[PDB]
Each structure stands twice: as C-alpha cells, then as structure tokens.
C-alpha cells in the first residue's frame, strides 16, 4: 500500500530518515458538503505545486536530495555533522532551523540559481 | 495520427507520439460537474507527475532507469515487444507486475541513486 | 500542528463510502504533545 511506512522514520535520525524520502512524498498528493471536499482536494494540489515550484526556483526540480552552492552559516546552526545526522531527528532539526528557513530559502534563490542559470546561459554560449 | 491514433500501432511506432497524448491530459447542474471534471483531471495528471518525480523521470516522456528487467515479468524479446505488440496488449501483459516495478523504480533509483550522487558530488 | 477540514469515511451521502483502512504506522521514538481540550 502507498500508505505503508508513512512517517515511520519520523523518530529516526536525520541520516536514517533520509533513506525514506519517497515514502513521505508519495502520500502528499493523494452542496457545501461537496464544496468542502473540492476545497480539500484543491488545497492538496496547491500545496504540492507550491513545494514543487520552490524546488524549481532553487534548481532542485525532480530531486529528493539536492546539493546547492549556498554555504552553511554557523549563525543558523553551529552543530557538527555527527550531532545533526547521527544524533538528531528531522522534527528536532526543523524546530531548531525554522527561524532561519526563510533566510536559507532566500539565499537558495538569490545566491545561486539565479546566478547559476545566468552563467550556464553563458557557458553553453561559447 | 492525432490523440490515441497510435493505439493500434506497435509499441515502437507508438513511442514517437507520446506528446500527442500528453497534450490532452490537462485539456447548478453542469456547473458542479464542470468543476469536478477540472479538479479530477488535475489530480490524475499530478499523480502521474508525482510518480515520474519519485522515479527521477521528472520533465521526461522517455526515461531510462537503473532497474534491470526481470524475466518473470515478461520473457519476450525486443522484437516481440516493440515491433510486434501494441501498448494495450503490453499493459494487459504487465498488470500483476506494475506495482513491483514501481516499487523498484522508487527504491533502486532516485533514492539510492540520489544518495550516491550526494556522495559523488562530495569530492 | 494544523487546523484543516476533515472528510468522513463510512460503510449519509455527505460522507465517503467504502470504510477507511484500519492500518496504522507506528512512529517509533516520536513523543507528541496532545491537548484534547484544544
């Protein structure tokens, strides 16, 4: 079943939970009584498309794991890789980084893909 | 040949008209039914796009994979699939194995593959 | 935490027919704060 294993890794470490990215992805999309159902279906669609649009803007379209050229700022989190990937879960991480999520997203757009695509436009030019 | 014109064509010949079908997936009484039809068309289109995303096939109509073909799914040779069979017959033949293949595409690639690319791009 | 409109499964016409799947996924090591009054 598509539902099987959904959020099973929620309490797992960030590394281990990164091996289940398709399990939590495949379950994201699927009278006033009738209107209420249409709003719920449209909302599921709108949220899916907003997340896919963000992935497109960052140059991560079609990827579950996407590497970027934005350096990590120690002001966002000064934990090392063992503390984040081996000793912490994604819920704890989200709680720690939610204050910096919009800064990071802004950099993902402003500090790379807008510059990377404009440079790729000039490398395929020669 | 227009929409579904290649339905009776062999799988090989039919594979060159994929955009013809792709273009036709998006586009009180009679009002409600129209809105429901529009929402259903969007949801089914996106369900297929979500699967293409998960398999690493986003933005492509022909997508090659890292999942080997298991002879238990079908033991036909290529000349008996692409040259002498239609897609409707193939779909009839691959029915019981569709979920196995989809699960393998989800696990064996774009999950393990992305972790491998994540490590390869590390050096 | 979120507030969203829920739909009904059953097995009226305002609900969805065919019953829900009983299956549940255990969230090991997940401790979640609940409040039945909110």
């Amino acid at each position, epitope marked *: 079943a598509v539902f099987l*294993g959904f959020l*099973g890794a929620a309490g797992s470490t960030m590394g*281990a939970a990164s*091996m289940t990215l*398709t399990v939590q992805a495949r379950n994201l999309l699927s009278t006033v009584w009738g209107i209420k159902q249409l709003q719920a279906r449209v909302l599921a669609v709108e949220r899916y498309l907003r997340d896919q649009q963000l992935l497109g803007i960052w140059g991560c379209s079609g990827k579950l794991i996407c590497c970027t050229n934005v350096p990590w700022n120690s002001s966002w989190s000064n934990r090392n890789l063992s503390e984040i990937w081996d000793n912490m879960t994604w819920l704890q991480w989200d709680k720690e980084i939610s204050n910096y999520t919009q800064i990071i997203y802004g950099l993902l757009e402003e500090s790379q893909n807008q510059q990377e695509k404009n440079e790729q436009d000039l490398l395929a030019l020669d | 040949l227009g929409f579904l014109g290649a339905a009776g064509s062999t799988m090989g010949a039919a594979s060159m008209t994929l955009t013809v079908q792709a273009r036709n997936l998006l586009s009180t009484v009679w009002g409600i039914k129209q809105l429901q039809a529009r929402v259903l068309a969007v949801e089914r289109y996106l369900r297929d796009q979500q699967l293409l995303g998960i398999w690493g096939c986003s933005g492509k109509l022909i997508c090659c994979t890292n999942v080997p073909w298991n002879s238990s799914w079908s033991n036909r040779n290529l000349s008996e699939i692409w040259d002498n069979m239609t897609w409707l017959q193939w779909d009839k033949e691959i029915s019981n194995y569709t979920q196995i293949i989809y699960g393998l595409l989800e696990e064996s690639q774009n999950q393990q593959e992305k972790n491998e690319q994540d490590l390869l791009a590390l050096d | 935490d979120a507030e969203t409109t829920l739909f009904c499964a059953s097995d009226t016409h305002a609900c969805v027919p065919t019953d829900p799947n*009983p299956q549940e996924i*255990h969230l090991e090591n997940v401790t979640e704060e609940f409040n039945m009054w909110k």
Partner: antibody
Amino acid sequence: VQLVESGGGLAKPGGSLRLSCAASGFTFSRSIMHWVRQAPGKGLEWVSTINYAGSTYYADSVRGRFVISRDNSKNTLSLQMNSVRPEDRAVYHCAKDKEGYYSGGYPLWYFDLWGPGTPVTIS
Amino acid sequence: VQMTQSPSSLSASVGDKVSITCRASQGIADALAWYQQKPGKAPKLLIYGASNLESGVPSRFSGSGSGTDFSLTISSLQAEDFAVYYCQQRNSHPPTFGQGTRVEVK
C-alpha cells in the same frame, strides 16, 4: 533457509543475558529481523525488531532494557537483555519478515521464517 | 489489538475437515496471518493477508475473514497438520497473537 538460536539460559532477577541467532539460507543484509518470545502461560509475544538499515523498534515492556542488534558480516542477529526480570521467562525465537512492497524499511511484522527458539529462565 | 482464538482444544480424525477461528477486539481489515507450530519446532507461516497462502504451503490450507471475524479451514486434516495454530494481527503495533488452537488426534 533456517534460523538457529544460541545463548539464553538462566539469569538472576537483575542480571543480563545475551541471545544469538544465526541465519543460513537467505541474504542477511536486506531482511528485517525480530525477536519474539513465548512464555509458558501467555503465548507468543513480539519483543523487538531491527531493519536492514539498523533502525530498531521495541515493545513497551522491554524498551530501555533490551538492545537488538545485527552483524551482517556473520549473518548473526543478537539481543542484549539487560535488567532481566521474572516476567521475561520465555522461549525466544528470531524471525524474518516477509518481503513486501517498499516501505522505506518499515517492518510488516508477518513472520516469514522462524527459528526453533532458545529458552530463557529468570531466577 | 487483542486476539481471541477458539476452540482451544480441537480434536479430529486424520480425514476430517476442520475450521479454527479467531476474533479481533478491533477491526483489522485483512491484516492477519496464520501460523503452524509443531512441538519443539519453529512456527511456520501459513497464511498472510487473511486470504493469501504462502509459497511452500499446500492448497489444503485456506484462510477467510475480514474486519473482526477470521478463520482457517483445513479441507483434510492429515497427520502432518496436528500442530498448534496461531492467529496474528499486524494492523496496529505491537503485533499480537492469539492463545493458539492445539489440534489433537482422536
């Protein structure tokens, strides 16, 4: 295709015991392995499981006392039973989960293969 | 989910058709399996999914049921089928087993 338990035996009301289980005919690297115990007066009870990725799940009655681990290089499953108590008397069986649809490592808990089991007595 | 299995003291001849049943305290759809345990031996999985038979198990065994009401039917109880049978649900964690039905030879 067999599971053979070893270890077990008698331990004090506040001591510790190690259990071992050797796999023979299957690939001990893709399997989800589970300790299940049968007490003389209760019947079969699930104790703990470890998936192929090394993540573990425990029953509420043993969480914090038992540690389940695997070593793929020896095809061996083991259980470290700390702070064993009188209610822990049982025959401990190792079991392998039927492989199903990809769940990201989440167990199904259908016990496809069972071992003979090893007795554990607390006194 | 608590599972109650009955009868606990079934007896039959080597040529009889028998049925072992169980009840779930909660509905579990078809998330149920049946096991066979010979004395001194590892339990063997017979049925998964309530109605599905495992490879290596003869068509002699058949499962049926849904929701809360499940059964195991043996069309002919041969000498190799006198064992303790178990009812197990996997619909909600932890997994639970019934007390078992011990099939005896008259």
